[PDB]
Write a protein that binds this ligand. Structure first.
Ligand SMILES: Nc1ncnc2c1ncn2[C@@H]1O[C@H](COP(=O)(O)OP(=O)(O)OP(=O)(O)O)[C@@H](O)[C@H]1O
Ligand SMILES: Nc1ncnc2c1ncn2[C@@H]1O[C@H](COP(=O)(O)OP(=O)(O)OP(=O)(O)O)[C@@H](O)[C@H]1O
Ligand SMILES: [Mg+2]
Ligand SMILES: [Zn+2]
Lengths: 310, 975, 336
């Protein structure tokens, strides 16, 4: 089941900093923010963007593996120095490629190949819009997310829940609203599920595994850290792990105002979406699905990760 | 350890400072200069091995050219002509740009003879050789006297070695200036180490070889470590006043310098390559703390002149020692952080709740606050173990083995080919003993190290903070005493009652933000400081720097504001009566406020009394003095909680003060409301160190040796990019230190601005508006300068971000805007400046331009300064920005100039300056094309390129619109 | 939430300067979008002006519900009592608002939420200067697409089904327009120094005016809708963006001091104004009213949307700044 929400207006997701600070910024939608919308209409698998321009397609955050020239980076290790570096096969230094990757390109991406037409830049999906003088000194400037003409937010939720099909509901920060409809699973997820067996066989035969985080994950057990615990990987069937090479970005620091306790929630650090881990696993993967949940708060749409080969 | 320090001294002084004077007996002078500390034969062999290895791999592997002779280009000029083939006088080449300089004063002091080269028994050599021996003996004697005094001063070998490394060059220079001349000493200090390849001076080689020997002592394997404390921009962003920003930057610099100081203490001051610690004010303060050298306040210490990343090369036997070093750095930094936190906890937090039960309630979160403060920063120490490739075989065999190892790396083709070419060129020399060293690929290691950091700093580990209201300033951490909102408000109200000078009652801070706020009052009573004096500057808010503009009367309102408190007298006497009257008004207002506060009895009497000489300058703004409530809020008091906003009898003196302020404005002018934030960064430092932007080897060798070598070596050197080496890296770091310490604070102070951080390439300043463009071009020229005077300079390009903003805008918003402007300047090419004016009401302009164009814009400002050209000529030209084409641009602008100029000469000058200036403007095309910006930056046949280009009309329209925007921004800045 | 929604039309009688952000030329640029660059009014400002109008009407007691006057003074005591009379003092002290505004247009400064969320005012017809047919209402195909996507959520009956037939593609130098705008003889039309060839079609404008008069009445804001049909043009997306960016009213203003009779130094500035006779549409999303012992008259969502439409139909209200110089007055016609 997919909740397709077209924003009639701009959307706001409050930054952790308070806003007498009139200046205010905006961030990408958070799983805790969108979870409240669906619960106002169970677990949430995650959320992507959707673009309906002639055809309807779903876009996830561009993996940090992909470079500017659409060149994949693989972690290769030198035993002479005994150190592993992420080589792009065209240079030793690289930068992450911002934008979004389609599911139709994602299916091929996990095999180690990507096409130019399978990616979309960030400027073609949504932009940031600044408003000044909103309301002698009461004026505050607020940045919001302005979506494209034929684009919106798709929320991927397991088909075990049901509710009203179509309507209008309020989401985000300030009192805005979007039009939501219930759409069945597109052919992209079906194709991914069909090719999951082949890609899992490739992963098993090659002895290499890649974890791609399509959503932010709070992996911290006692505190909060980007380190990948071996116990979590052992649950899926990994007998042993040799080396772990994680590449991501600045951790997303977020909290919230808990209305139940009338007090703010504890501040939490999460691994940013699009980060990729490379793991040299031993044995085979027993997972029967191409998507798994990691960390805590996985019900709200946190820690959705895909499997890939290299 | 004493023998370790003595051996470090021996390695540093393994070559006499005048080695290039005569290569026949340099080692004898090296043994004599140490005297009782001369090394043994085995120690000399080890030192020579560690010098030939590493240091400058290009140098030694080139000096052994055997083309019918072994070349020699020294000052001796008397050699065995049978197999030496003298070349000429030694020169010095810039390690980056290859700029060539000559020692005119040294040659003038040296004897001059008609014959260029003398044979072994050449006729007439008696007098010249006698004079040469005499001057060499004098130089040796003065060097020995300096070193003997230095050795007599210090007894501990560690302290003696550190002080020698710090100050021997300065002492020798001052002694030679006292004897020969200042110019002679200045040129002598910068003598090259290896005259055949003079890409670095002798002392840079000495530091490099000392670091190499330290990294290869007692069988310890060398390791290249790089330490980074991240993030930085987020930490600096969170601020409310300029004092908070200064405290944040200075705290970050102090932390990284604590790490650097621990590393230097454990191993040596030279083991750190970047930043160059010699000459750093922080290093001098640390030396004073160690009671090694009495600190002199020649260079101001208030500047955060230490970058957040530092690179070192140290010798460790095993990875266990590396882990121990990392744990020691973390222990030292966390101990300093915990000491600061405990000082704040037991000085400020308990300073207001010494009796209240709220302290007992909040004492259960002390461990939590300590943990969240300590783990605020992520510290990454990425270390690469330098591999020891076997070179046991012959020259061809050893070079083949090294190339095979490099191929076994299995790298991308470009860098592998570059390093293969470097190795092949190193193998193009003719010598049986020519063997590649383990540091020949040093640059490669560094490159990998950097990449490691870019991944290793990605990780993080933050503690599980509890639930509660977050901090108001930082907005990311739980505020202190966050269990209850009412309890937190009461606690912070009590704190503001105890500490009303800085903190506001409503401001509920966290650990990190409170530490940042109260850091200035704690640094003067902490380590490194507390014995140096004058660390905290006398500037707290951006209003002061915005008020630092130089008016037409030769007076800056910041000086008169300081005069209000009597800090500095006013030299001008024409306005003395107005100054006295307004001072009396301020004094009586302060007396009334102090009496009212004493009646309230809510703040300590010391703070109220000191408010007379520490009153906020924001009350000087007339618009800010609307009423008593506005005055109380501006001074830093919440009148709503105080209840003093109902005093309606305090309007008479307010009105009188407003009238007096207007009277002062009459012949003075209002305090300007705008100020400029300028941040600059180096252009492709990583690429420059990668060797991609480095010149060919022919540019880093003697001017008269490329033609006197083998053809194969000649062609290899002419078409192979030179790669850095530890000596060259040290020279580059020394040039960066020279730029960042000896030049930028001078121009900032001369520019009447405040420099906050100057570490290496990056620079951050806040300036009065009509002082920013004056110093931006000067600093760009200085950074691009190769040889200024007789001191090295980086000689690279700059990216700059300049933002002209009002003082009421939030600090972090302006910081983020300026950082975004810098990023845009880097995105639209490089060697450029992005200027942006954010006017108060709604206005916002941009212009990404080359530096040389900026001065051109200043020209038209003159035409607007005295109204030689009507300003409307700008507006009308704007209306043509969407229609103008290349063919008729010149004629149309000529028509507009003639129409809007009283004199035809003014119109012609405007036409010429506009035609020149509008050429260089970076454009943001719809298509992802950067070739146009690259053509604009260089300065070329760009007109012909646009003629060949298919989007010429859009490019020229964007160029003219951006130039007009820059002109309007600069003109509004002037007025 | 937000069970129902209503559409509000807005016709600019006088130029409107709402809000203020590049400001490259105009010191106070109009309230403008980011992705498309079209003129727009933020939901915050429209909500504020609507709630101020509602509060003033509640004070004036002219909010007749179901053809019966709504007396709030008795209603607050009827639904709250106890401190309600004291709560009246809060209205008298101006620290609060009348209960109707508190339960519909959001709460006071200090628990609850507004029953209606006010969306953004999206542009629908932009007036541009024409060589023939003095001024023309120009649109863009994506404007029609946005209108259809917005209007799929309210009308759906057959009007929504027939509105799906609007689907056009236009080149950057072609347009479809009425007989008034097209020049005599030559088959081209000039708007704001831009010449466009007329594309032969007779369905898109008819359907547009059909739906406009369908849910806005035959009286098109005091004018016959039939006359409007002859002066409707649809241009390309880039052309519409350029029009909406550069065809607004740039007015230069100064301040003169009586001491010398000349312009004050630094007193000259340019302000940008949205042109008059501009049709804009906004979406108001109304949900279940807050459970606070609401009267049975407006107990359901249908009743509150009905009373809102009745009390705001054919209304006149000022938006944006410069109210003191006759700027911002617009006429609102609720979609029935
Ligand atoms: N104390 C300081 N004051 C001011 N600027 C500083 C200070 N220390 C470092 N900087 C500069 O601020 C910037 C922050 O460095 P940082 O390590 O965050 O790099 P970055 O490019 O922003 O990203 P990343 O965090 O991934 O390295 C750099 O340009 C650095 O030179
Ligand atoms: N002499 C030096 N030795 C070692 N590291 C240095 C030296 N000078 C600068 N650095 C470091 O190199 C890094 C350069 O990063 P930066 O973001 O400036 O990129 P860059 O390659 O210089 O180019 P650009 O900023 O134009 O993209 C910084 O972390 C800086 O501290
Ligand atoms: Mg750089
Ligand atoms: Zn904080």
């Amino acid at each position: 089941m997919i909740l397709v929400m077209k924003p009639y207006d701009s959307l706001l997701f409050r930054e952790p900093r308070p806003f007498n600070n009139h200046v205010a910024r905006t961030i990408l939608p958070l799983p805790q923010t969108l979870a409240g919308a669906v619960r106002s209409a169970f677990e949430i698998l995650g959320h992507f963007f959707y673009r309906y321009d002639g055809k309807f397609e779903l876009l996830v955050e561009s993996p940090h593996d992909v470079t500017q020239n659409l060149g994949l980076v693989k972690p290769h290790r030198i035993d002479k120095l005994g150190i592993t570096i992420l080589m792009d096969s065209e240079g030793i230094k690289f930068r992450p490629f911002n934008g979004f990757l389609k599911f139709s390109g994602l299916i091929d991406y996990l095999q180690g190949r990507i096409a130019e037409d399978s990616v979309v830049e960030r400027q073609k999906i949504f932009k940031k819009e600044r408003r000044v003088g909103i309301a002698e000194e009461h004026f505050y400037q607020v940045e919001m997310l302005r979506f494209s003409d034929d684009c919106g937010i798709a929320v991927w939720v397991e088909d075990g829940v049901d509710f009203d099909d179509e309507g209008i509901l309020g989401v985000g920060g300030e009192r805005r609203f979007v039009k939501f409809e219930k759409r069945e699973e597109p052919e992209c997820i079906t194709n991914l599920r069909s090719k999951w067996k082949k890609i899992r066989d490739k992963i098993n035969e090659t002895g290499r595994l890649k974890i791609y985080l399509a959503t932010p994950a709070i992996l911290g057990a006692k505190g909060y850290s980007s380190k990948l615990d071996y116990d979590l990987l052992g649950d899926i069937g990994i007998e042993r792990v040799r080396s772990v090479n994680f590449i991501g970005g600045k951790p997303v620091i977020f909290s919230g105002w808990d209305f139940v306790t009338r007090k703010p929630k504890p501040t939490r650090y999460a691994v940013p979406a699009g980060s990729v881990y490379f793991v040299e696993f031993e044995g085979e993967v027993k997972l029967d699905m191409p998507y798994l949940k990691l960390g805590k708060l996985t019900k709200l749409g946190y820690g959705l990760c895909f499997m890939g080969v290299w | 350890d004493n023998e370790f320090w003595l051996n470090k001294i021996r390695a540093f002084f393994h070559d006499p400072p005048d080695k290039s004077f005569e290569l026949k007996t340099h080692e004898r002078r090296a043994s004599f200069i140490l005297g009782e500390l001369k090394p043994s034969k085995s120690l000399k062999r080890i030192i020579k091995n560690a010098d030939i290895q590493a240091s400058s791999l290009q140098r030694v592997d080139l000096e052994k050219s055997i083309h019918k002779k072994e070349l020699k280009s020294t000052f001796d000029r008397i050699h065995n002509t049978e197999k030496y083939e003298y070349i000429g006088q030694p020169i010095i080449r810039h390690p980056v740009t290859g700029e060539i300089k000559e020692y005119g004063t040294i040659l003038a002091n040296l004897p001059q003879t008609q014959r260029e080269v003398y044979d072994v028994d050449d006729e007439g050599k008696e007098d010249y050789e006698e004079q040469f021996q005499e001057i060499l003996s004098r130089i040796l004697k003065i060097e020995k006297k300096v070193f003997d005094d230095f050795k007599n001063r210090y007894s501990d070998p560690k302290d003696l070695y550190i002080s020698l490394w710090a100050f021997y060059a300065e002492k020798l220079k001052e002694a030679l200036e006292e004897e020969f001349s200042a110019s002679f000493a200045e040129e002598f200090v910068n003598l090259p180490a290896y005259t055949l390849s003079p890409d670095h001076t002798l002392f840079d080689h000495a530091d490099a070889t000392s670091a190499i020997f330290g990294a290869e002592i007692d069988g310890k394997k060398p390791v290249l470590v790089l330490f980074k404390i991240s993030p930085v921009q987020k930490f600096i962003a969170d601020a409310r006043k300029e004092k908070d920003l200064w405290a944040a930057s200075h705290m970050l610099s102090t932390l990284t310098f604590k790490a650097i100081s621990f590393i230097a203490d454990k191993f040596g001051p030279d083991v750190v390559i970047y930043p160059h610690l010699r000459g750093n004010p922080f290093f001098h303060a640390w030396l004073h703390s160690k009671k090694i050298w009495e600190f002199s306040d020649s260079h101001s210490l208030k500047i955060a002149s230490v970058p957040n990343k530092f690179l070192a090369l140290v010798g460790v036997s095993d990875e266990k020692e590396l882990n121990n070093l990392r744990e020691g750095i973390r222990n030292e930094i966390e101990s300093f952080l915990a000491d600061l936190f405990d000082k704040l906890w037991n000085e400020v937090i308990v300073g207001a709740l010494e009796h209240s039960d709220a302290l007992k309630h909040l004492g259960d979160k002390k461990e939590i606050h300590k943990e969240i403060l300590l783990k605020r920063f992520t510290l990454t120490l990425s270390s690469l173990k330098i591999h020891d490739v076997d070179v046991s075989g012959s020259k061809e065999e050893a070079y083949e083995k090294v190339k095979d190892f490099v191929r076994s790396l299995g790298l991308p083709n470009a860098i592998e080919s570059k390093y293969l070419q470097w190795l092949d060129m190193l193998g193009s020399v003719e010598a049986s003993n020519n063997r590649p060293t383990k540091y020949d690929l040093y640059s490669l290691y560094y490159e990998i190290l950097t990449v490691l950091n870019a991944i290793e700093s990605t990780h993080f580990d933050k503690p599980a903070e509890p639930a509660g209201y977050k901090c108001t300033l930082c907005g990311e951490h739980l505020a202190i005493g966050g269990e209850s909102r009412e309890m937190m408000e009461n606690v912070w109200g009590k704190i503001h009652k105890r500490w009303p000078s800085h903190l506001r009652s409503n401001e509920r801070l966290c650990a990190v933000c409170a530490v940042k706020r109260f850091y200035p009052k704690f640094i003067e009573t902490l380590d490194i400081f507390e014995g140096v004096g004058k660390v905290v500057p006398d500037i707290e808010s951006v209003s002061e720097v915005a008020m630092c503009r130089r008016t037409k009367h030769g007076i800056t309102w910041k000086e008169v504001y300081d005069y209000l408190r009597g800090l500095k007298n006013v030299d001008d006497e024409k306005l003395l009566g107005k100054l006295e009257n307004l001072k009396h008004s301020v004094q009586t207002l302060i007396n009334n406020v102090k009496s009212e506060l004493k009646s309230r009895k809510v703040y300590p009497e010391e703070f109220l009394e000191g408010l007379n000489r520490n009153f906020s300058n924001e009350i000087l703004y007339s618009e800010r003095l609307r009423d008593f409530n506005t005055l109380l809020d501006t001074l830093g008091f919440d009148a709503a909680k105080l209840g003093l906003d109902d005093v309606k009898n305090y309007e008479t003196m307010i009105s009188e003060l407003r009238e007096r302020l207007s009277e002062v404005y009459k012949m003075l002018g209002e305090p300007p409301k705008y100020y400029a934030i300028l941040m600059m960064d180096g252009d492709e430092m990583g690429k420059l160190l990668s060797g991609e932007k480095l010149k060919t080897a022919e540019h880093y060798l003697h001017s008269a040796i490329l033609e006197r070598v083998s053809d194969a070596l000649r062609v290899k050197a002419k078409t192979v990019r030179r790669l850095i080496t530890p000596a060259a890296h040290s020279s580059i770091s020394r040039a960066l230190k020279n730029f960042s310490v000896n030049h930028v604070p001078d121009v900032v102070r001369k520019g009447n601005g405040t420099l906050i951080y100057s570490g290496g390439d990056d620079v951050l300043v806040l300036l009065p508006v009509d002082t920013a463009f004056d110093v931006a071009t000067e600093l760009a020229m200085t950074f691009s300068t190769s040889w200024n005077g007789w001191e090295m300079l980086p000689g690279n390009k700059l990216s700059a971000g300049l933002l002209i903003v009002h003082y009421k805008h939030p600090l972090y918003d302006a910081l983020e805007k300026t950082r975004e402007l810098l990023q845009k300047a880097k995105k639209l090419g490089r060697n450029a400046i992005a200027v942006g004016l954010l006017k108060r009401s709604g206005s916002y302009y941009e212009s990404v331009v080359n530096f040389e164009t900026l001065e051109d814009a200043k020209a038209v400002a003159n035409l607007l300064v005295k109204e030689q050209v009507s300003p409307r000529i700008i507006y009308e030209l704007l209306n043509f920005a969407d229609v103008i084409s290349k063919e008729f641009l010149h004629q149309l602008v000529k028509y507009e100039a003639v129409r809007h100029s009283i004199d035809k000469n003014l119109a012609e000058e405007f036409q010429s300056v506009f035609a020149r200036g509008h050429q260089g403007v970076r454009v943001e095309l719809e298509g992802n094309d950067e070739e146009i910006n690259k053509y604009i930056s260089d300065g070329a046949n760009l007109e012909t390129f646009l003629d060949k280009y298919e989007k010429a009309v859009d490019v020229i329209r964007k160029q003219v619109r951006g130039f007009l925007n820059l002109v309007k921004i600069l003109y509004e800045s002037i007025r | 939430m937000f069970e129902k929604a209503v559409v509000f039309g807005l016709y600019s009688i006088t130029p409107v300067h709402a809000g203020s952000a590049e400001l490259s030329v105009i010191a106070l640029p109009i309230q403008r979008e980011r992705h498309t660059g079209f003129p727009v009014i933020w939901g915050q400002s429209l909500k504020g002006v609507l709630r101020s109008r509602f509060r003033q009407l509640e004070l004036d007691e002219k909010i007749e519900v179901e053809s019966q006057k709504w007396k709030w003074k008795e209603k607050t005591k009827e639904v709250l009592k106890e401190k309600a009379d004291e709560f009246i003092k809060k209205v008298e002290e101006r620290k609060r608002d009348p209960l109707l505004t508190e339960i519909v247009f959001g709460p006071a400064t200090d628990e609850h939420a507004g029953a209606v969320s006010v969306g953004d005012a999206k542009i629908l017809l932009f007036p541009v200067r024409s060589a023939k047919g003095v001024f023309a209402f120009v649109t863009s195909p994506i404007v029609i697409q946005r209108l259809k996507e917005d209007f799929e959520l309210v009308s759906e009956i057959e009007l929504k089904q027939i509105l799906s037939r609007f689907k056009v593609e236009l080149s950057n130098n072609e347009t479809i327009a009425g007989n008034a705008l097209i020049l005599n003889g030559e088959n081209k039309v000039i708007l704001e120094d831009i010449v466009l060839k007329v594309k032969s079609d007779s369905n898109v404008i008819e359907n547009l005016v059909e739906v406009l008069k369908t849910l806005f009445g035959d009286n098109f804001f005091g004018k016959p809708i039939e006359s409007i049909k002859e002066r409707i043009a649809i241009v390309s997306d880039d052309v519409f963006k350029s029009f909406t960016r550069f065809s607004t009213e740039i007015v230069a203003r100064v301040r003169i001091d009586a001491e010398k009779g000349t312009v004050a130094r630094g007193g000259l500035w340019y302000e940008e104004f949205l042109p008059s006779d501009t049709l804009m549409y906004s979406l108001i999303a109304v949900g279940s009213p807050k459970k606070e012992n609401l009267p049975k008259e407006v107990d359901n969502t249908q009743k509150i949307v009905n009373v809102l439409k009745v009390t705001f139909n054919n209304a006149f209200l000022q938006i944006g700044g410069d109210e003191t110089v006759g700027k911002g007055f617009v006429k609102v016609r609720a979609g029935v």
